[PDB]
């Protein structure tokens, strides 16, 4: 299917890294690694379970960075009394996501904290 | 000014309730009192509700619901992935789309929280 050390799954290739890097660096690492490569994105339940088995089985990894994050001034935050949120008493820091290879749940996690990850590219 | 059990300020009346309730319920009640969950505009009205919350919830072990939430149709709010993929499927263990005054910072910071987590709240009329 794919190329050495990368596992193949439905037109895509995944490789788990134990190296433990930050979210923003892990993504940068997946890009300057493979042409059109990225930090793993889960578009189905079966794809997520494939990754977890890959990360848990051949590497016994529990947490991995996923290509999902955002800042609050990006979300549709609205009040209930009508006012328009301009006073951002919310940290500007971004939210990041890790996947757990046990149940496949996604958990918010501090971005600037090293975590093993998973890269993904399309053949 | 308002009801004795409440506190007036800038043409608005607030009050912190020790009794817990989901973000939903908390609002359904604020409305039942001709209002909504507190909303902050100025930094003035902010530290005010901070004191107001600080004075009432003297113990600091609970977060107080406010009137801010994430309208997002999705579990988490990121619409696109890093690879350009549209966020269709999700599996967030527990999405947090309802904000409340962060008690771990003395109610001065806002923290998103699980809507459904029974916390005390703040109403405004």
């Amino acid at each position: 299917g794919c190329l050495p050390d990368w596992s193949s799954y439905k037109g895509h290739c995944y490789k788990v890294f134990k190296v433990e890097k930050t979210w923003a660096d892990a993504e940068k690492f997946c890009k300057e690694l493979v042409n059109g490569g990225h930090l793993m994105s889960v578009n189905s339940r079966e794809e997520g379970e494939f990754i977890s088995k890959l990360a848990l089985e051949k590497m016994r990894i529990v947490l991995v960075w996923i290509g999902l994050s955002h800042f609050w001034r990006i979300c549709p935050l609205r009040w209930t009394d009508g006012a328009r949120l301009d006073y951002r008493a919310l940290s500007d820091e971004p939210i990041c996501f890790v996947a757990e290879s046990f149940h496949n749940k996604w958990i918010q996690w501090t971005c600037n904290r090293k975590k093993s990850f998973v890269c993904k590219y399309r053949v | 000014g308002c009801l004795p059990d409440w506190s007036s300020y800038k043409g608005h009346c607030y009050k912190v309730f020790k009794k817990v309730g989901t973000w939903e319920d908390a609002e359904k009640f604020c409305v039942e009192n001709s209002g909504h969950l507190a909303s902050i505009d100025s930094k003035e009205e902010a530290d005010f509700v901070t004191k107001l919350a600080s004075q009432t919830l003297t113990k600091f072990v609970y977060d107080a619901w406010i009137g801010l939430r994430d309208e997002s149709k999705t579990q988490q709010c990121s619409p696109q992935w890093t690879d350009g993929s549209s966020v269709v499927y999700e599996n967030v263990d527990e999405p947090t789309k309802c904000f409340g005054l962060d008690v771990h910072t003395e109610y001065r910071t806002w923290t998103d929280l699980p809507c459904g987590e029974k916390n005390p709240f703040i109403c405004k009329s």
Binding site: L56, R60, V62, I107, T110, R113, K114 | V61, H104
Partner: protein, 202 residues
Amino acid sequence: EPPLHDFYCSRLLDLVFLLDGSSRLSEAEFEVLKAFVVDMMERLRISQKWVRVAVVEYHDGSHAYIGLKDRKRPSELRRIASQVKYAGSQVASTSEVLKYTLFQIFSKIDRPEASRIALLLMASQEPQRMSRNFVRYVQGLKKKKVIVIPVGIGPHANLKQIRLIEKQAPENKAFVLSSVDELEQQRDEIVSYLCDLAPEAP
């Protein structure tokens, strides 16, 4: 007593081993855990002037087998660690143990030169009720400069609490292992990190 293995952290350090005592770990798994504590100790210059060691098995409450001021033979301590009785309780309150660590173990920083580290070996999740003051304790530690290294083991670890800890400071590097078997593996990567947080005897 001379250095058993080459890995021989010799810096000013006060390390506290907190061992999950819940039944989320079989008896055998607990032994593998206890074996971990011993291995680590075989890689530390356990002296009152270098690396002091403490071992605590927590469950409903906390039971200390070794304290930082226990001036015993380094071999005698590892022997104690290896013989740590198995509780198997239903709940292993991390809050209760971190409270203990903060209000008892490091109640007074009488060793200002050394670094304080709490290796929180956890394999379960305490009921949301005992977690009332969790953050307040973790914060208290941050003030006492007591680094807290959350080590998640098995599929029942808290993760939410682990994350909370790793969020207080970067020094609180977390480790999420698939099982106790991963203790043997990542044992060294842990001692290196643990060691690199301690000063250096001038």
